[PDB]
């Protein structure tokens, strides 16, 4: 047949975008699964980074092509929503881009490709949700099992019996049941050197990362306390502009010293009058956080003092405490303060952590701050990472209850069902659905290739096994072959696959919708 | 001096180069000739884009290194004041004359003979125009006024103001009547001030019988209007040039107060001076104080207490306009101010135009005056500029019509008649005069051909038909379809061009042709 | 070398080539974004750290720099769409680009100045707008609810104004002055009479047209079956300026005789009026006793000092015209007025016009206490009428899916036959430019644009067809049955803006290079 | 107005032929008359 001459060829832009996106997808594909190959990226600063994590690889790749950055955006969205599978979404996007290129070679307009991909993605999501094994957030056993399964990939395995229930309870204290999406970012992981893995605490309220004043006058605790966030510092007059002290007599020096002491005392008294029993001073290198005279005055005023507080802690406490920051002492009032039954520093085996409990404030929310303890820095780092992974898994369960079999079994089943169903379709839709079903098998193929197994044979074995079972058999690295993943306790949240499909569909639609590139400045 | 990077032409390429440069310059605005001429995009160095077909504007904003082109543009700049609306026609005629002179030189004719023959041909063409001219003012005053209004409307209709151009034509006619007398029949454009600003609509045009003086009255509490005081003898104006402040040093000043004695002395001096000035103003009986300079705080307070609105920083020309409109005199100083020198005006009030909130101050007489101001407004800067240009063209056309009762008709009919007369006379004069007359006639033929080309008509057939109609049947006013017309014979279409305007166009074209031809050597140095 | 600062006039051939091709190329930036199914465009910054993807035509045009001056001019002219409507800039740009491309093709086929092309485009645009107006439908059913809403809006607007003296009365007056017009709601169709001797609450409503400054010295106070023609003649105070003129006379008596003869010379024009069948004459300027007697002898009523606004409004209500000379008898347009009455309101003379031919106007009489009250009342009434006029602009819709555009193209094609051959090509070019829009819409939707466009054209051409483009199913469906309609105002504004933009660039011969920024 | 498209460019060939013919004519012109200049080939 014949087509438009197209002296100007916008299709070249789409071809280039597809080529770049598919190249990035192929580069990221080889890292899928526990057996994924490590990637080496050298930064402009000379540092060498080796890791098989898709997120880090994408960030360090410094992708310059504007369209290829859609893959980084998809990975970020997956991390925000699912927290895992950043490689799977990229692989699916690459497979869909290849399918779209093949469809274009057949003479199919990109808009129809996008619409048919959207429809196929909707049908695949429906099929996936149909086969999901539902779970209840009120059943701690299921969440603990899922958390243990997720933690089994980490070095800390024998202690998972405590890490799993810890995360389960931490999430449940804020998610309850039928809460729809719950953001795990409100959960704070506080690390402290000392103790062992078994040493941990949830604290249903909020936990501060700084200790109380260890010098004279430090109460170290105070009951019936109100906690406020202070951005200023208690120090003598320190104008931001040119200033100096001029003395012409001993009386003038005495007057200046008395004025400075009076200013410090007045600042402390103003703090006390607001009924702020816990003082949180932001770290500063230009003004003393709390002068020694100020410390003594606060101690005489029965005010708990905590200094050397970073911006991140203040931001976290802005939600944990429910109070508001105070720009200056002139604006320091009770309305800017929080509340709590008691605030004290806890030192059981050297913990030395200040905690706030019983806030009982409407603005304040139960932002559970899990305390992580460990003698070695590696112990606490690994515990933090493992707890983050467990929290992500539990969040995936909360948003969409239930788990699905891993190892690519749902991908194979969905591909088979879609291929069978597309036979009833007519027109370009049938072709696009067949291409989508064929592309869906990329994930199991990548898993088989990365595992050192026969790529073609594994797919055939999975397809044959799925004729009798349903979401039960898949690729497992433990058996070096196809086995019953469900019986192997290899389970993944359904939300991960659903979000992967949705993000891949959105990314392919966005990539195909770009028909021209122009400069704007 | 500055021998390096110096170029010159003489003997071989001087004439050809000059004529080619003139032709290139002419081609810039050749397509813009006539009311339907194509527009040209003019962009300022700051990136402001403007669209207009005015040949004078196009040439004025064009700078170039060519000497002949620079001379032509400079001459057009001066001619813009003489005629204004004939710049493009004069340029085209000069270019055609130079093109003919090229062939004449190629035949062995010296440039001086070409110039003399062109001058004689211009004389003959002017004589023919005078013979074929018609008088409107000598036929009927009503018809004369109708033709004045028609010319103003024709000038205005080429711009956006065509929707309501009648008001602009009426204002222009009223301004000409007020400012021009029949003793000289010359409009003093210096007494017709052009002013405007962006905003409002084309219907906000107003003719003022005096100066505007859009001032803020200095002090915020100073009244912004001077009322007639319920039938009083108008408003008395104090025309002053001395600043309303006591003499002050020009080196140090810093007249600060350190003790009671210095305060008392300085206050005595300053208060005595201010009191003298204010008492002189009051004795003069003036209601509004107008000074060429600003006012001091004490002077402003005293004027406010005495109910004497102040006008600050009035220019010399503005003072002359005040004196003319109010029949007053300029008083150098306060001490020389008296009731015998104060001017009188109907009122000094704020006038709002459209949605404008500025509330500009205007001095109004409501009577016939020798000086008027044409106020122009519009929804856009382009509208205001086009309205001002059209008003200037209408004023020039009215001045030309009143100055000489003899008029000609546009559309190239006068050009065709002149060409026919010159061609007929050429065969009677022997020698180089015949060639010069033929060349002049061919150059005259250019204008109607250019107009026909700009109107989408074939210049060859159009010119031939015009010549046939004006020769075989009778001498009349038949031109090209410059605008949408039912047929030819502009005489019935009322397309009239002043006789003096056409004579000036021909004379200026001949002078420009002589100026370009008389230069046989050009020398240009380098640049630093 | 000419001009300078990188701003120089380009050769005529290249200047025209730029003016057309570069301006057309602006459409390609937004052509793909036309319609709800349009494509996306990537805008990349120099640093690449602020690149973004958008499908908004206005954003694309305003963000991407345009070095070619023709593109700058086209965008600047098309910007009026955002202020007028705020949407459809993509359609305006696409239509302008298509019109410019068709004009360029015509020029390549003629190599003549596009002034004839401009005239043909004007005629085709007028025909297309007339067809669009004919094809529009009214959704203003239940006009009682609209009247109630207008009353409420008027009451809301009258707050804090001098008119608050009788809020309900003034709201009713304002609502009536808009509703009873049954046509244009412009303030020119509404007259305000400002008189003293009463309270603003006593304002009266008069559907007739009322003027001030009564006319005539010996004229009758009542005129019936008036044949109205307006002229601009100086029938009073002839020879305005004579100072400095030398008169070859022995005394002022002969100068007066010469002036009398000059006045008498106007008798020919005065008599020419009677040959038109005119019995009522309106003059912008004053009329002297002699011309008044001449008109009386002819039985023609003489109206004086009609000015300009009065003349325009009187002609609009009576459907007359204003001329300056009477070239030939029996060739003019005459207005009609059943009854004209001389009345005085507030001790001030006024002229009342009733029975105006197809008169569509209303008058409101204000009785105030001082000038400030009357001026404030007039301004408040103008504001209220302007606010209320919004109801007469909405609810006007046309069939969507290109049905209205195809009907307009068919109307233009019809106009292409009843026109001279030198303009039929331009009319057909305008029709093709109009037809380009549905083709681009179909292309953006991913369907076979040629088949859909041909089917729609055949359906619309074959009589009372309301079919249109089905961008969801990729076929042809009845827009009226599906309820697919689009705002009439949007289409009218888009077409007018595109025509104006095409005209702006067509009249340009050469373009000076734009100064880089 | 609208006139013939004139897509082709016969004017180039026509003008080239005219130029050649005019050159030959100018070469032959100087031999006209009894006092014509002699030509050497």
UniProtKB/Swiss-Prot annotation, chain A:
InterPro entries (alphabetical): Chap_CCT_delta, Chaperone_TCP-1, Chaperonin_TCP-1_CS, Cpn60/GroEL/TCP-1, GroEL-like_apical_dom_sf, GROEL-like_equatorial_sf, TCP-1-like_intermed_sf, TCP-1_chaperonin
One Pfam match: Cpn60_TCP1
Xref: CDD domains: TCP1_delta
Localization in the cell: Cytoplasm
Highest taxon in the source lineage: Eukaryota
Record Gene3D superfamilies: GroEL, GroEL-like equatorial domain, TCP-1-like chaperonin intermediate domain
Biological process annotations from GO: chaperone mediated protein folding independent of cofactor; protein folding
Keywords: ATP-binding, Chaperone, Cytoplasm, Nucleotide-binding
Gene Ontology molecular-function annotations: ATP binding; ATP hydrolysis activity; ATP-dependent protein folding chaperone; unfolded protein binding
Miscellaneous note of the record: Present with 5530 molecules/cell in log phase SD medium.
Oligomeric and partner information: Heterooligomeric complex of about 850 to 900 kDa that forms two stacked rings, 12 to 16 nm in diameter.
Family the entry assigns: Belongs to the TCP-1 chaperonin family.
PANTHER family: CHAPERONIN
Function: Molecular chaperone; assists the folding of proteins upon ATP hydrolysis. Known to play a role, in vitro, in the folding of actin and tubulin. In yeast may play a role in mitotic spindle formation.
The name this protein goes by in its record: T-complex protein 1 subunit delta
Source organism of this protein record: Saccharomyces cerevisiae (strain ATCC 204508 / S288c)
Native organism taxonomy: Eukaryota, Fungi, Dikarya, Ascomycota, Saccharomycotina
Gene transcribed to yield this protein: CCT4
UniProtKB/Swiss-Prot annotation, chain B:
UniProt cross-references to Gene3D superfamilies, sorted A to Z: GroEL (3.50.7.10), GroEL-like equatorial domain (1.10.560.10), TCP-1-like chaperonin intermediate domain (3.30.260.10)
Any one GO molecular-function label of the UniProt entry: ATP-dependent protein folding chaperone
Record-level GO cellular component terms: chaperonin-containing T-complex
Compartmental location: Cytoplasm
Tagged with keyword Secreted: no
Family of this protein: Belongs to the TCP-1 chaperonin family.
Function statement: Molecular chaperone; assists the folding of proteins upon ATP hydrolysis. Known to play a role, in vitro, in the folding of actin and tubulin. In yeast may play a role in mitotic spindle formation.
Name of the protein: T-complex protein 1 subunit epsilon
Phylogenetic placement of the source organism: Eukaryota, Fungi, Dikarya, Ascomycota, Saccharomycotina
Curated annotation (Swiss-Prot), chain C:
GO function terms (MF aspect): ATP binding; ATP hydrolysis activity; ATP-dependent protein folding chaperone; unfolded protein binding
Disulfide bond sites: none
Domain of life: Eukaryota
Keyword entries, A-Z: Acetylation, ATP-binding, Chaperone, Cytoplasm, Nucleotide-binding
Subcellular location: Cytoplasm
GO cellular component, one term: cytoplasm
GO terms, biological process: chaperone mediated protein folding independent of cofactor; protein folding
Alphabetized PANTHER family for the sequence: CHAPERONIN
Quaternary state and interactors: Heterooligomeric complex of about 850 to 900 kDa that forms two stacked rings, 12 to 16 nm in diameter. Interacts with PLP2; this interaction leads to inhibition of CCT complex mediated actin folding.
Family to which this protein belongs: Belongs to the TCP-1 chaperonin family.
Matches recorded under NCBIfam families: chap_CCT_beta
Primary role: Molecular chaperone; assists the folding of proteins upon ATP hydrolysis. Known to play a role, in vitro, in the folding of actin and tubulin. In yeast may play a role in mitotic spindle formation.
Identification of the protein by name: T-complex protein 1 subunit beta
Lineage per the UniProt record: Eukaryota, Fungi, Dikarya, Ascomycota, Saccharomycotina
